From a paper:
[name] F is a class I fusion protein that is expressed as an inactive precursor, F0, which is cleaved at two sites by a furin-like protease, leading to the formation of the disulfide-linked F2 (N-terminal) and F1 (C-terminal) subunits, which associate and trimerize to form the mature prefusion F protein6. The isolated antigen-recognition domains of these unusual antibodies are known as single-domain antibodies (VHHs). Here, we present the isolation and characterization of two llama-derived VHHs that potently neutralize [name] A and B subtypes and selectively bind prefusion F with picomolar affinity. Structural studies reveal that these two VHHs bind to a conserved quaternary epitope composed of two F protomers.
Sequence analysis of [name] and -L66 revealed an identical complementarity-determining region (CDR) 1, a similar CDR2, but a very different CDR3. [name] and -L66 both have a cysteine residue at position 100c in the CDR3 and at position 50 in the CDR2. A disulfide bond between the CDR3 and a residue at position 33 or 50 is a hallmark of VHHs and helps to stabilize the extended CDR3 loop conformation. In addition, the crystal structure of unbound [name] was determined to 1.9 Å resolution. The presence of three consecutive serine residues in the CDR3 of [name] could lead to more flexibility of this loop compared with that of F-[name]-L66 and allow [name] to bind to an altered conformation of prefusion F. Although the possibility of selecting for an escape mutant could raise concerns for the clinical use of these VHHs, the escape virus was severely attenuated as it was impossible to grow the virus to substantial amounts to make high-titre virus stocks.
Numbering used by the authors: 1 to 52, 52A, 53 to 82, 82A, 82B, 82C, 83 to 100, 100A, ...
Write the structure that this text describes.
Amino acid sequence: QVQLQESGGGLVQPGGSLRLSCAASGFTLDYYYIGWFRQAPGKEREAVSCISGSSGSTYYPDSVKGRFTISRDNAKNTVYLQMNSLKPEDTAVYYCATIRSSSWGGCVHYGMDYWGKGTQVTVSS
């Protein structure tokens, strides 16, 4: 039942912006925490943005804090990651993940229960 489907990947120029969407099915945002993760080529997968489905409270790691913002639309059951001022080092597959807020334990890859299949973002150079 619980599934996530990311979309919006494509080629961006450096300094450009891109918004990714994560469509939730099998659940509603209110009971969960939604996270965005990324894997740049050769690199370990790392957290990027978490959001609370109910309150909309957010968590941003140092590397993207300021440039990346996550938002959620309860009515559309969708979580969005806005990326501003993109850098070539942001090239990665961006994954959506979620966990029931009852089990919420921080914005870490080992604390997620369901994973999307990813969507590739490439910042040309």
